[PDB]
Amino acid sequence: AWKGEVLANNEAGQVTSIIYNPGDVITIVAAGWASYGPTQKWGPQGDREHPDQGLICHDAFCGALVMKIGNSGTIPVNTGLFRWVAPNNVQGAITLIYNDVPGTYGNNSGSFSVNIGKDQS
Amino acid sequence: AWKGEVLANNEAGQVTSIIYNPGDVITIVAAGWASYGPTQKWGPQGDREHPDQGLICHDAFCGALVMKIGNSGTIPVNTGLFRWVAPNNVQGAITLIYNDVPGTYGNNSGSFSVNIGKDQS
Amino acid sequence: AWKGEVLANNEAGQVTSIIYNPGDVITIVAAGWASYGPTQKWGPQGDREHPDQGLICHDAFCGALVMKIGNSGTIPVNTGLFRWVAPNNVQGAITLIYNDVPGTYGNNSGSFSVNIGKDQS
Amino acid sequence: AWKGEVLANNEAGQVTSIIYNPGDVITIVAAGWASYGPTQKWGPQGDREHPDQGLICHDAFCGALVMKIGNSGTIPVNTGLFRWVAPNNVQGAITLIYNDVPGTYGNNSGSFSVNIGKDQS
Ligand SMILES: COc1ccc(C(=O)c2cc(OC)c(OC)c(OC)c2)cc1S[C@@H]1O[C@H](CO)[C@H](O)[C@H](O)[C@H]1O
Ligand SMILES: COc1ccc(C(=O)c2cc(OC)c(OC)c(OC)c2)cc1S[C@@H]1O[C@H](CO)[C@H](O)[C@H](O)[C@H]1O
Ligand SMILES: COc1ccc(C(=O)c2cc(OC)c(OC)c(OC)c2)cc1S[C@@H]1O[C@H](CO)[C@H](O)[C@H](O)[C@H]1O
Ligand SMILES: [Ca+2]
Ligand SMILES: [Ca+2]
Ligand SMILES: [Ca+2]
Ligand SMILES: [Ca+2]
């Protein structure tokens, strides 16, 4: 398994040791509090009231946890994924990223703690 | 494994099909949006700004997900637990409960979608 | 999980650390060479040519690996069981035993090396 | 997971659905009775008394279960593998094969029933 943190201010995102291969089943659990700028903080599902001004993932809220698998588009993680199979034909290293608008990470704060494991299959 | 909804207004809580036995390793993933009364909604970590006015779980925020195992006291769940082993001598049915003040659940709204599975041991 | 040795000359068999609980899924893998008396040796499936002269398990060959779960009768194991669920209402410690005729274990030799794990459920 | 039969008389072997990838933990359970020619039959550990006359796998007995992983050389399976990882730089499709001398498969009979699963990591 992999265990680490994802900083809200990291535009590049946090590379993990997990390589998603075809047929893999994985479980992700994410926790913690972070901000895209404001004083308030939000958990891994982010801020359901904030408008999307060009987020790196249009299928999750501003301040939510998202990922890429290899060269893929952004995929919502939020609080996690239970015994999940990639619905698309994606393969490769998982990178975790805080959902914010490109070029606006500098004022972000906080972090999520994240576990990723492969399940039986 | 078990998958189901934990209603915010369900004061008795949601009994699951999971019996926790000594040595069991479990994973929980919880998602969704709910309120203890206000117009706003919060995830399974609840509302970090809201004071404790007599919650069923003093170790989690108002609006968070908690559980009991058989006749245990409440245990925080929040977004979930990854390959978790019970610290205390506990056993029996896992029940999932929305964290609010007893007798104040009537004005609650939303639900959390929750998966629980036993892991390889 | 549990790992250990099942000696062919141990009429009581080997009590393992595994407590089989309702709903568990288990995997057993057994390996090695053992004898019920002759200079020849046989693997965990035993000797398919040998008549049953009062074996502890009538559903496996003489020299096979078998088990008991709590107060059950003998259940054939042979080379192992893959993601296996016990009959309804069978529960308790798993005991591994070499299949021979009671009172005839003293001339036995060799052992099976066995792994038992709980699988995801 | 994969489940299927490996015939003793199939020189090329049984190609499975399992692609072994770097990091994968696998379990195999093999069972059954087969012959390399004589009237006797042996399980997946094969015949410990038969000399090696140019077997496809010098590390296992004649009549044992063996495998190839992608372009690897033969690797013993015998009764199976419990939560096993392959050597570095061994990867690809698993093919299961009865251990005999090339060109001598036609007088073989019987089959092994095999299960292969990927385990939690
Ligand atoms: C207290 O935090 C904010 C309040 C409003 C905005 C807006 O930019 C905004 C702009 C609007 O019109 C131009 C608008 O509609 C009238 C609106 O509706 C609520 C919000 C952004 C932020 S944080 C700000 O968020 C962005 C991400 O969207 C970046 O993360 C930035 O670094 C943050 O400071
Ligand atoms: C070389 O070792 C043996 C040879 C024959 C027997 C028989 O008792 C036997 C008797 C038969 O008919 C009367 C028979 O006819 C089909 C047969 O066929 C192969 C074998 C047992 C044994 S080992 C002996 O085995 C027993 C368990 O069966 C005990 O484990 C004992 O300790 C061993 O010495
Ligand atoms: C070394 O391998 C053998 C040698 C001889 C035989 C016999 O068929 C045979 C025939 C006899 O009469 C004509 C006989 O007289 C009593 C005898 O004594 C033992 C054996 C079979 C085998 S198995 C052989 O194994 C190889 C692998 O090593 C191949 O799998 C082959 O296909 C098998 O036949
Ligand atoms: Ca920002
Ligand atoms: Ca309330
Ligand atoms: Ca004996
Ligand atoms: Ca042959």
CA angle B20, B22, B25 (to 5 degrees): 65
Query: Within 6 Å (CB) of ligand 2, which residues are found?
Result: C 36-38, 50-51, 53, 62, 100-101, 104, 107
- Give the tokens for residue C13: 């068999």
Burial of C98 (0-12, 13-18, 19+ CB in 10 A): buried
Q: Which of D45, D49, D117 sits opposite C43 (nearest CB)?
A: D45
Cα D96 from chain centre: 4
Unique residue bearing structure tokens 């913690």: A32
Residue D93 has, within 13 A of its CA and on its CB side, a CA count of 8
Beta strands C14-20 and A109-118 are unpaired
From ligand 5's centre to the CA of B41, what distance in Å?
A: 12
CB-CB neighbours of C100 under 10 Å: 27
- Nearest chain C alpha carbon to A120: C120
- At a CB cut-off of 8 Å and minimum separation 6, what does B52 contact? B58, B62
Contact B119 D119 (CB under 8 A): no
Residue D14's beta-bridge partner residues?
D96
CB-CB neighbours of A53 under 10 Å: 9
Alpha-carbon distances of C52 from B111, C14, C66, D97, D100, rounded to whole Å: 61, 22, 15, 32, 31
- Give the tokens for residue A33: 């509090």
Instruction: Point out the ligand nearest to the CA of residue D62.
Output: 3
**SS3 of residue D1 by DSSP:** coil
Residues of A in CB contact (< 8 Å) with C are: 119-120
First to last CA, chain A: 15
In angstroms, the separation between the Cα of residue B19 and the nearest Cα of chain D is 21
- Closest by alpha carbon to A74, among A96, A49, A93, A89? A96
Contact B121 C22 (CB under 8 A): no
- Give the tokens for residue A47: 């801020």
Contact D115 C82 (CB under 8 A): yes
Please give the full DSSP string across A58-105, using - where no structure is assigned. TTS-TTBEEEEETTPPPEE-TTEEEEE--SSS--EEEEEEE---TT-G
Residues in chain D: 121
- At a CB cut-off of 8 Å and minimum separation 6, what does B81 contact? A29, B26, B27, B28
Residue A53 has, within 13 A of its CA and on its CB side, a CA count of 11
Q: Which of D21, D22, D120 sits opposite A119 (nearest CB)?
A: D120
CB-CB neighbours of A15 under 10 Å: 13
Please give the full DSSP string across D33-102, using - where no structure is assigned. EEESSSSS-B-TB--TTS--SS-S-TTS-TTBEEEEETT---EE-TTEEEEE-PPTT--EEEEEEE---T
In angstroms, the separation between the Cα of residue B120 and the nearest Cα of chain D is 7
What letter would DSSP give residue B28? Answer: E
In angstroms, the separation between the Cα of residue A16 and the nearest Cα of chain B is 17
If one counts the domains in chain B, the total is 1
Measured CA to CA, the distance from residue C72 to residue C49 in angstroms comes to 27
What is the b/e burial string over D40-63, where b = at least 16 CB atoms within 10 angstroms of the residue's CB? ebbbbbbbeebeeeebbbeebbbb
Measured CA to CA, the distance from residue D65 to residue D7 in angstroms comes to 10
Which conformational region is residue B45 in: left (phi greater than 0), alpha (psi within -120 to 50 degrees), or beta?
alpha
Measured CA to CA, the distance from residue B69 to residue A33 in angstroms comes to 27
Q: Whose CA is nearest to atom 13 of ligand 1?
A: A53
CA angle A97, A103, A105 (to 5 degrees): 50
- Give the tokens for residue C85: 């669920």
Measured CA to CA, the distance from residue C115 to residue C99 in angstroms comes to 18
CB D19 within 8 A of CB A22: yes
CB C14 within 8 A of CB C6: yes
Unique residue bearing structure tokens 């009764």: D79
Measured CA to CA, the distance from residue A105 to residue C100 in angstroms comes to 71
Element (H, E) at B69: strand B65-69
Which chain C residues are closer than 8 Å to B19 by Cβ? 21-23
CB B41 within 8 A of CB B50: no
CA angle A5, A68, B113 (to 5 degrees): 75
- Give the tokens for residue A83: 């015994």
Measured CA to CA, the distance from residue C69 to residue C74 in angstroms comes to 8
Contact D118 A121 (CB under 8 A): yes
Residue D106 φ/ψ, nearest 5 degrees: -70, -20
Beta strands C109-118 and A2-7 are unpaired
Measured CA to CA, the distance from residue C42 to residue C48 in angstroms comes to 10
Measured CA to CA, the distance from residue C78 to residue B114 in angstroms comes to 39
- Deposited resolution, Å: 1.8
Query: Within 6 Å (CB) of ligand 1, which residues are found?
Result: A 36-38, 51, 53, 62, 100-101, 104, 107
What is the b/e burial string over C49-87, where b = at least 16 CB atoms within 10 angstroms of the residue's CB? eeeeeebbbeebbbbbbbbbbeebebbbbbbbbbbeebe
- Nearest chain D alpha carbon to A115: D121
- Closest by alpha carbon to A75, among A92, A88, A57, A89? A57
Which chain D residues are closer than 8 Å to A19 by Cβ? 21-23
- Percentages helix, strand, coil for chain B (3-state, rounded to 5) are 0, 45, 55
Which atom of ligand 3 approaches the CA of D53 most closely?
A: 28
Measured CA to CA, the distance from residue C40 to residue C63 in angstroms comes to 11
- Nearest chain A alpha carbon to B78: A31
What letter would DSSP give residue B64? Answer: B
Domain that holds residue A70: 1-121
CB D110 within 8 A of CB D35: yes
Instruction: Point out the ligand nearest to the CA of residue C40.
Output: 2
Q: What is the CATH number of the domain that holds B117?
A: 2.60.120.430
Please give the full DSSP string across C45-98, using - where no structure is assigned. EEETTS--SS-S-TTS-EEEEEEEETT---EE-TTEEEEE-PPTT--EEEEEEE
Q: Is the CB of D9 under 6 A from ligand 3?
A: no
Alpha-carbon distances of D72 from B58, B65, D14, D67, rounded to whole Å: 58, 50, 15, 9
Alpha-carbon distances of C68 from B121, C52, C89, C121, D93, rounded to whole Å: 20, 19, 13, 22, 37
